[PDB]
Paper text:
As a proof-of-principle in the utility of our prioritization scheme, we conducted further studies with a schistosome protein encoding a putative valosin-containing protein/p97 (vcp/p97/cdc48) ortholog (Smp_018240). p97 is an abundant AAA-ATPase that serves a major part in the regulation of protein quality control, including mediating the degradation of ubiquitinated proteins via the endoplasmic reticulum associated degradation (ERAD) pathway. p97 is a pivotal constituent of the UPS that extracts and disassembles its substrates from various cellular compartments. To further our ability to conduct target-based drug discovery, we obtained a structure of S. mansoni p97 using cryo-EM. Cys519 is positioned within a flexible “P- loop” of the Walker A motif (GxxxGKT) in the D2 domain of p97, which appears to be broadly conserved across multicellular eukaryotes, but not certain unicellular organisms such as yeast (S. cerevisiae).
To ascertain whether there were any subtle differences in the conformational changes of schistosome p97 compared to its human ortholog, we determined the structure of the S. mansoni p97 apo-enzyme and its complex bound to ATPγS, a slow-hydrolyzing analog of ATP. Interestingly, Cys519 naturally occupies an inward (in) position in its apo-form, when bound to nucleotide substrate (ATPγS), or active site inhibitors (CB-5083). We hypothesize that this loop is involved in substrate sensing and “breathes” in a naturally flexible state, but the predominant species is found in the in conformation as seen with the apo enzyme or nucleotide-bound state. p97 is likely constitutively bound to ATP or ADP as the natural concentrations of these substrates are high (0.5 to 5 mM) in its cellular context. Indeed, most purified recombinant p97 has been found to be prebound to nucleotide that must be removed by heat or apyrase treatment. However, our enzyme was purified in its apo state, suggesting that the allostery of nucleic acid binding may be different between the human and schistosome enzyme.
Author numbering:
A (entry chain D): 193 to 428, 433 to 546, 554 to 581, 593 to 709, 722 to 758
B (entry chain C): 192 to 427, 434 to 546, 554 to 582, 593 to 709, 722 to 758
Write the structure that this text describes.
Amino acid sequence: EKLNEIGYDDIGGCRKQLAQIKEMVELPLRHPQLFKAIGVKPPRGILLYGPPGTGKTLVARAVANESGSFFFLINGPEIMSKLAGESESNLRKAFEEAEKNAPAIIFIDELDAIAPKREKTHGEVERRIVSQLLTLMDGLKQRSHVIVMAATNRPNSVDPALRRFGRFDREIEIGIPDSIGRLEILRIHTRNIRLAEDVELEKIANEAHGHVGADLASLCSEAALQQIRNKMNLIDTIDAEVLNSLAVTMDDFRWALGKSNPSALRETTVEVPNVTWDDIGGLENVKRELQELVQYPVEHPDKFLKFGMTPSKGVLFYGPPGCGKTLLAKAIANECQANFISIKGPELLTANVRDIFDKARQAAPCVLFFDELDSIAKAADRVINQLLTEMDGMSAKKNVFIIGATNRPDIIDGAILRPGRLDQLIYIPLPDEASRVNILKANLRKSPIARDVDINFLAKATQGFSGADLTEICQRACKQAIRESIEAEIRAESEDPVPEITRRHFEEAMRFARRSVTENDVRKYEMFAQTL
Amino acid sequence: EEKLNEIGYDDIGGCRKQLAQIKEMVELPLRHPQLFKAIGVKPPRGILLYGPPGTGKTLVARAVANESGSFFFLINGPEIMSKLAGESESNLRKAFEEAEKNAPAIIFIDELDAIAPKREKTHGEVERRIVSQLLTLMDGLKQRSHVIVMAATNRPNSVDPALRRFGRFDREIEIGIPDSIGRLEILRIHTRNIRLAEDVELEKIANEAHGHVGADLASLCSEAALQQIRNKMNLIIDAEVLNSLAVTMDDFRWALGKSNPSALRETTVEVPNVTWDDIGGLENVKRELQELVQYPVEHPDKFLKFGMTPSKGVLFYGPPGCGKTLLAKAIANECQANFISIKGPELLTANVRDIFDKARQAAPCVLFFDELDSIAKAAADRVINQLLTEMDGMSAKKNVFIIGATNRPDIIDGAILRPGRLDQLIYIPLPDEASRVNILKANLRKSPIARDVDINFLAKATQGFSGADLTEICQRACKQAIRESIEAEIRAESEDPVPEITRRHFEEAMRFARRSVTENDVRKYEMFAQTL
């Protein structure tokens, strides 16, 4: 009933992948004439992979319902819970019924349950089931309009034989949703819940980092439970008056979000960052160099082809700590609308390097950032060799730009800086007056500031201060404001006095203002620049 | 049925030497047995075809069977291993019996590793029984019976060692990554039923499709056709639209850009297309390399007459960026000898023996070990001992020349330099005027330079610049050209000004040109030469 009405509007968090799968399945199964005319082979093996709870179990059924095709479902656990022969019989019957009712889609949920890695199987019956699956997969004639889709947590957990060139040759990753995907999921799940007029789902979506569809559903459930808690406890069968006055409020959603333990906080996020140049300032020389390196290839490839010269895909930022190299990488990615992948040294020290580079390849225009590079370059030997091998194997014609940041340029292994891997070095110095002004405005954007506090004088006063120092100054001013508010409220209770951060807060925070970079360190960096 | 029984040597691409070998080896004995029997040639019993997936080794056996007119029986590993305990053995026996009944015949075992994996991988008792039955059947083929058993595996090491003995599987052929000509042949095969436009030059697509196998090229063609469908149908099924479809070159380049080949990491064994002119080179080095490599291959009779076996070990040493790899490629090209390139990081990441065996398979081959200092230096111990053992084990009568390149000649362990291992040390210095002119011309071959630009003056100005420095100068000139062109386009829009790299561009690019090799390093190398 309800299953046969699931469509593209009932799946959220995957809109690019959904368009891919639409082009890849629906059009072949609706107008085969054109595809067979021009000679396009429709796919036969589609493997959807990603973190759990992402809604990839509904994609197959949505495609089947929208394309008008028959749908057959194989649950791995259900097949593997039967006897030695009944599992084989059920797989064969599934494929036969799919062929008899063509066009059709066969969905194998939890393929790793049926066909795990060859070394994870200890008996012969399981190997027989894997071999039966392979034999059935190869037996699908090209003419027969049967598409086999499968879902797994990771593609490495599946038997390597299944990922060959005629069995499962298309792979799609349905990963963690971005902010827009989170908002779509929230709208889908709150369709039957009665929200209050003050509910602004956009802000809940933006603050729900590392949430998947299941996590957001649990968040909505917790918010509704909090609303019931309050109302029913204060109005403790339940009378009809209360049941009609229940509407979730933004306070409930914030309470739920604060106490929510999302299941995907440790997964790499591939998205276009929302950091602009106005939040970092930056020397105009750096902006020009980074645009020439990361934007001209992506926006004007025709001119590079015309002059016949391949751009370099490597940059090394070096400079005092806290000067904002990560923000610069994010900003250059944002300008070109390219994805951003951030990897820290500690994460690498904790195989995987190839996975990161493959993920970068999948996102065609991507800025891959290796923060704290000195910890990897001069366990260290293995990771450094793997990184060198991967960088050498990255085609210069593919738009994957590698940026590494190091605070100790003199200790980095020379092999990293050899031409072809990371040949270009950029020096990020301490911010100048305008850059400090922009940094200060960026930090204070979200806070209520007094109409007399002038950011220009604070910038003029702060010289030799890194971005971290300015952030600390702002934090200290806000802490003083909060203390004053607490004290004023307590005194009023004993008998808003502080509506915004005044000037006294700022010159009291600036009393203990310590520059974190000494002139000796700046001279050391300048000397390293001169030697270059 | 008819389609399968009508595929021949013209429907397989990417393997033209191996097909000739298999043709001589199988088809002639099975067509004119009397001649081979009279002379005393024993036709082979076991042919094992190995290589990366997607190459086309699955169709080779059928092509041989169809062109020779011999009966063909197919055995699928997954299909045999998906049956019950006794049914698998019954099927193998029936296959061999039917092959013997109808002779001559060819038995193809696809995925032999499925039936006969390494004994360690096998755990059960039925699997070992299947392997033993296969061995017994193979040994039961009388020399008179005209049955040839071909098999296919990804890597021969994955097969049970017992099968690779004499009399069971004694012939081994490798169907590796296709070269440019093979890629063009595959593209022609796959584009037979696709309407191509008049601007489609498949040769360029073949040349730029590095790391592709037959399946990858098929997917590339499919993506190009799908892009054509997108472009035409997005505005727009009407008959005129269907008849007005023709894949264009832009679609092919889009597909190539978005393609992720599956064989990007496999070693390539081919004759490089780098000539002496591209590198420049000194007459002394060219003459020495000719004596060392070309003379043994082209004139072995004279070496036999004078009765002195040639040494086959060279160590190039010189400042970085001087073009040692290009020298190795050029010497390989002149003699039409294959080229295998191994980098130190790849080795650091059992495989040494495989590399040397692969070199041995290619009769004239130049085995190049770049960055030798990483391995050999006064993990490391194991690799260096394996390298020394394999080098001592190479007969001086086989044409496998080993060239190693090092930027730090004084760190190499003396064992590598002992006579009989790498005994000819050659010094590649910084290029002179003519070499610099050649380097500059080679770098600017693919870009439109202006008529006023004179490479002779550019070479005169640049002295002490390594090859990398000249390449960087050309890169900077091109980058300035791109910047000027983009700015001119923007100014025109606001309302081809730069169709060539002018001389102001080179003058500006040479402002920051910095020599990468100090005179101290050159003197250090000269001192090492004197001590030698």
